[model samples]
Target: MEALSWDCFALSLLAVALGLGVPMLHHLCGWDLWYCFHLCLAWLPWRGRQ
Candidate 1:
């Protein structure tokens, strides 16, 4: 095991945010309603995986 790093967390969050944000930016201004659940499930555990 190793200590967690804020930079990594922030980067992961940013990646997820952009993943959702870019699509929504051009389409709508809400969650990824079409595939929101899957998207979250994929990214939410990102920190743990790291």
Candidate 2:
């Protein structure tokens, strides 16, 4: 079994943050939620590792 690395752990936290924060930001600030999601994906830390 593979151990969890720091990048993977950070990615998990990033996913959770984006998942909950994006919608809340949309609700409170009228931001473009999906656009921000895509933006986040574009800069995801794990993307370069794959």
Candidate 3:
């Protein structure tokens, strides 16, 4: 299945959220969601397909 183009906007918001969130996560628990980071930062072949 391809990524919904709708997610494009969502990712835009998430990109900003991630920028702010990572710092909090780093300070709060000192652990980061690497996979979430990947999903947020990654360029999946199907992400823009749909």
Model number with the top TM-score = 2
What does candidate 1's lDDT look like per residue over 1-50, in tens digits?
14778878889999999997887674465555656655676678563444
For residues 1-50, could you state the per-residue lDDT of candidate 3 as single tens digits? 26657668788889889997987567567655765765565666555435
Clashes of each: 0, 0, 1
The lowest-lDDT stretch of 10 consecutive residues in candidate 3 is 41-50
TM-score of each: 0.44, 0.48, 0.38
Best by lDDT: 2
Cα lDDT, all candidates = 0.69, 0.75, 0.69
What ranking emerges by TM-score with the best candidate at the front? 2, 1, 3
Model 2 lDDT at residue 30: 76
lDDT of 2: 0.75
Give the per-residue lDDT of model 2 (tens digit) for 1-50.
25968878989998999998977677567756666666777688765445
